[PDB]
Amino acid sequence: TGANVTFKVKGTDKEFTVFTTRPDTLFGATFTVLAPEHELVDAITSSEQAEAVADYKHQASLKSDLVRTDLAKEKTGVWTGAYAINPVNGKEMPIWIADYVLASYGTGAVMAVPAHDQRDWEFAKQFDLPIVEVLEGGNVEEAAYTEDGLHVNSDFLDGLNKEDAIAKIVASLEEKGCGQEKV
């Protein structure tokens, strides 16, 4: 009961898809995270980042899934040198690779919404990435707010609930060809 969302890689011919349960949190997506093992990684890595990205892929391949998805472990990762385009507002989002995302978790790609996902939150805090609230009810600078609330900072989604916003966002994307609901 989710949605596939497609992100273009800025300045290239490349794209990747993320599967998300919460397409309505799209305006809160401040970066994207690919599993170190994702197919796209080598293609979009900048020449400056290439060596750190290779050391990081090596290090992550030395860790089991269970270790990598252990919430208590320090968050770890490296910037690819590339940016993704948010299909709803064209904003640029850095593309990082990180342990905590597995190649088998969905598409191996997540749109990170640190304000409302604990793992993304901890990664954003670790790496000083921006945190933007889109569901009201919490204090996202101090703790991820992982519950439902009315939308804010979300343009045409402002004031709606989960069911409503999911409907509108999905329509907006299917019409553009940048998304679609998947089961």
Curated annotation (Swiss-Prot):
Keyword ATP-binding appears in the UniProt entry: yes
Keyword DNA-binding assigned: no
Gene Ontology molecular function: any one: aminoacyl-tRNA deacylase activity
Entry GO terms, CC: cytosol
Compartments it resides in: Cytoplasm
Keyword annotations: Aminoacyl-tRNA synthetase, ATP-binding, Cytoplasm, Ligase, Nucleotide-binding, Protein biosynthesis
Location (main, coarse): cytoplasm
Gene Ontology biological process: leucyl-tRNA aminoacylation
Family: Belongs to the class-I aminoacyl-tRNA synthetase family.
Designated name of the protein: Leucine--tRNA ligase
Species per Swiss-Prot/TrEMBL record: Streptococcus pneumoniae (strain ATCC 700669 / Spain 23F-1)
Classification lineage: Bacteria, Bacillati, Bacillota, Bacilli, Lactobacillales
Residues of the whole record sequence present: 228 to 410 of 833
